[PDB]
Design a protein around this ligand. Structure first.
Ligand SMILES: c1cc2nc(N[C@H]3CCCNC3)c3c(n2n1)NCC3
Ligand SMILES: c1cc2nc(N[C@H]3CCCNC3)c3c(n2n1)NCC3
Ligand SMILES: c1cc2nc(N[C@H]3CCCNC3)c3c(n2n1)NCC3
Ligand SMILES: c1cc2nc(N[C@H]3CCCNC3)c3c(n2n1)NCC3
Lengths: 282, 283, 283, 283
């Protein structure tokens, strides 16, 4: 009988439990992510502040449900306090110190086997969310951070600000179970896999022409980046980057795919990712 | 000029033409299925009774059209009589005595792949006919697939049109332009039946709101030792039937053209664990 | 900075610029296509006349945008004049003299597969351009595919924008998020044209409400001896074009990336029965 | 009988008349503003490109009507051309080389009150013209106020009609009766600009949902030592422009009749801290 706690929204002042610093960990959509310290344990945590509204409360609740998943940033506690007379919602999460996804890759020969291990970890985050009827709708590398600078660090998905719930006899078809989109997550998965295997997006900028290339579905696997990469892997990208959402690959299908399913037993054929990624163009 | 008869709803008392017994052949959705006897011929027939309403008249009319198909239980005649002052609709069908689909399979204790294919072909012809005349069954499951006789030459036939529904009112005109229509649920059903035929248990067991998830997510397995000896072609066919998204799923025309179905004669006899696994009734 | 001219609707009498003959080049949907001559150059051009309305002005405007594409009949100038007190819209295009698609095929009594591919590639570029600027032709058939001259170097061009319609008003944004749009009918049409090119007859003959069925169902064959020598790759391409469900069907970008099209030069010359089979006019 | 030309939208390729360079004069709302050269005269002009739609055509038309006003950037000619198959709208304007409003003020000596008034008068005449022909700019800010040349006789001109909008379709008839209409936002903007001109910083700094508050509430100060020497008359004029309630706020006609504006010549030269305070860029 495996039961976990419900979400408790703490009403007491956050400063009773945490030392809140002004150190900005990262600027983002909903605001500044601040570094804070647990008074009793002295561990570092991240703090995200939002104006308290039902939409805000809905997202936090989804993230809370999601926090059980190993590859989703864990919400440790949530407060509802009063800041400047405005009713605010303070969200405390595990501090991910290992940096963004692509930042780690460029700071080192990058193997294919390691790309697969990354894609498998990102996919488990989507699989969990989709299996509990949650669509992230903002899966991009800015929202994939490592827990520590350590090389055993686990990769974790963050920012549930666009997250949305997808819903309120053995022959009943999926359609009959009810109307639902989460295909955009899988599109995002395809873009991320593309950049991981090569080092640049499949749709660059010019800009109203980039809107076309997406709508049309026109992208290439140009050499010398892609020459050494298998037809199997290119096929997987192609099924992720399907223009029509109903044609596109589902998360269950993705995770069952050999390249993902066998992250252990997969070629180490070097990639140009680390090199190509190095082009900052400041 | 091949013309068949229109549906005639007989107003005369059914007891003039048939001896109606109280022997219950099977309890079902719309009620009890009774065994009856043709007075003039003395043959056994099944009788289904429904309250007479336009919805009822519509289903019967669909079944009647369908009754020309070899693998759909045949409606022999239809009566509209008065029972208890309520206006009733009495449907008389060919009587199927050979038992449900899986029942026959478990009572031969070795089941071959070739024979599963022949079954799926026969079930598919029933769906092909229905779909080809714009009818969606929407209740294709083993309970509604019965054999004509206990004989081993028995032909398998589809029954229960209670959820049946009609799907409708220059050589370059596309399918979409011909009109707006779903019948993909019949193909999902076909996939589930094929899964159970090849192994002996559903692809989605019960835990229960988690089973709703496994269907919506499309997660199922081909676990050994049941599926080990079954080909990648067959698994692929199930995989195309059990597509979560209806527009992605296989159509009936595609299914019937697939080699495993199209060549039911020239297909391996590789034994299946179906009969064994099916034997677990768990009373 | 590659900029081309905007559409200018000339208000001056067309007779000032052109000698308009009474020779009918072809009868069609929106009217007769008349042969005309540029006074100053003495070149042959085709003239299409429509009643001037915003629907007419919109189509013309699309054809104008499309006229930059090599495989789309070029609009040379457009006039708005008064004819019989009714306000008319006179469209002048390049005169295509080489005849319809299948006419040129049968007048060479030995048609190779490689040549079919080069045709499909040319037709596909016309669709690719249109779809890439959010235009859907919705009337792609051989009647509207004509050659520029009787010359064998003639280029094939798409015509008749009377049913043309516009399909519209952060690197991770999905195509669905860019906005709601159909142009899959153009790809179906492409599949039908390809079928006839490789064999000599449609994939859906007539009988007539049965032909409506065969389309809606997706039932067509690759019968021998027409198709025996044709590869599985090519049949597979037709099969993806003739998908009943529009969302399953092949997109133009996908079509043009397909090796048979992409490698129109490095493709077998395996003879086709097209020229022979096509010859049966049955007058 | 003082009549001016209507707007002619030229269809010919802009490159026929102008040499379009790749030099970006400024990045903006609707796109990059490129420098171009008139082939026949060799003068420098600015080019703004927009996607051609009725909304785009509406704004351009307003700007065209407005271009007669001395203090509004002058549209010299407009083209409708085809760029990349997309139908575009190319707008050619007089080129303003003198830089933005505040840029000039800092690059100098002290800044006098008399000069601020002359600026406010020039900006007010732009609003007065627009409002008198029922146009509301809705984007009057310093970024959109540029000088014609680096010369100190340069005239200040309003730009960017991307948010511009038309405010409309017996001597005792009240203004309300003439019809329903907002252009008070242009006057609020005028108040903010005047505040910054007299001191060197906005009246609403950032602290961000709290800056939304300070605006909604209407809370701002005239702090010393910036405002100490500035008269009660000038402060009062700001207070009438910065009225929270739009119906309470000053109209353009009232603004221009106000003595500080009306007597830009006969007004104190009391030095301002603007030039000093503005110098704080904080890179
Ligand atoms: C939990 C959440 C979080 N978000 C972070 N930064 C966010 C900012 C908004 C977009 N995604 C990245 C950072 C973190 N953490 N830790 N640690 C270092 C920077
Ligand atoms: C025609 C129809 C029919 N329906 C039957 N039984 C139905 C009951 C409802 C669900 N499907 C099976 C039986 C039959 N028949 N014969 N013979 C034996 C039992
Ligand atoms: C441009 C357009 C056009 N349309 C033509 N004829 C149209 C008639 C309607 C259906 N499609 C073909 C002909 C032409 N042209 N040339 N030359 C010979 C006959
Ligand atoms: C006319 C219009 C225009 N717009 C300009 N730049 C705009 C960019 C959008 C916001 N306002 C400023 C510049 C110009 N001009 N000249 N000359 C130098 C820079």
């Amino acid at each position: 009988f495996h039961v976990k706690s419900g979400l408790q929204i703490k009403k007491n002042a956050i400063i009773d439990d945490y030392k809140v610093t002004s150190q900005v960990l990262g600027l983002g959509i909903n605001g500044k992510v601040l570094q804070i310290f647990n008074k009793r344990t002295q561990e570092k945590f991240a703090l995200k502040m939002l104006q308290d509204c039902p939409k805000a409360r809905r997202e936090v609740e989804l993230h809370w449900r999601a926090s059980q998943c190993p590859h989703i940033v864990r919400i440790v506690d949530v407060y509802e306090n009063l800041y400047a007379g405005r009713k605010c919602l303070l969200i405390v999460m595990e501090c991910l110190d290992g940096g963004e996804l692509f930042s780690r890759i460029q700071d080192r020969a990058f193997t294919e086997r390691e790309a697969s291990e990354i894609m498998k970890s990102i996919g488990e985050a989507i699989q969990y969310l989709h299996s509990i009827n949650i669509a992230h709708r903002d899966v991009k590398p800015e929202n994939l951070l490592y827990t520590s600078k350590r090389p055993n660090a686990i990769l974790k998905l963050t920012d549930f600000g666009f997250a949305k719930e997808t819903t309120s006899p053995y022959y009943v078809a999926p359609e009959v179970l009810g109307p639902e989109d989460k295909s955009c997550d899988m599109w995002s998965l395809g873009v991320i896999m593309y950049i991981l295997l090569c080092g640049y997006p499949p749709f660059y900028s010019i800009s109203p022409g980039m809107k076309t290339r997406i709508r049309m579905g026109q992208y290439e696997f140009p050499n010398p980046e892609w020459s050494e990469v298998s037809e199997e892997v290119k096929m997987l990208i192609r099924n992720l980057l399907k223009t029509e959402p109903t044609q596109r690959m589902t998360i269950t299908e993705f995770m069952n795919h050999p390249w993902i399913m066998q992250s252990t037993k997969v070629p180490q054929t070097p990639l140009h990712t680390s090199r190509v990624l190095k082009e900052d163009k400041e």
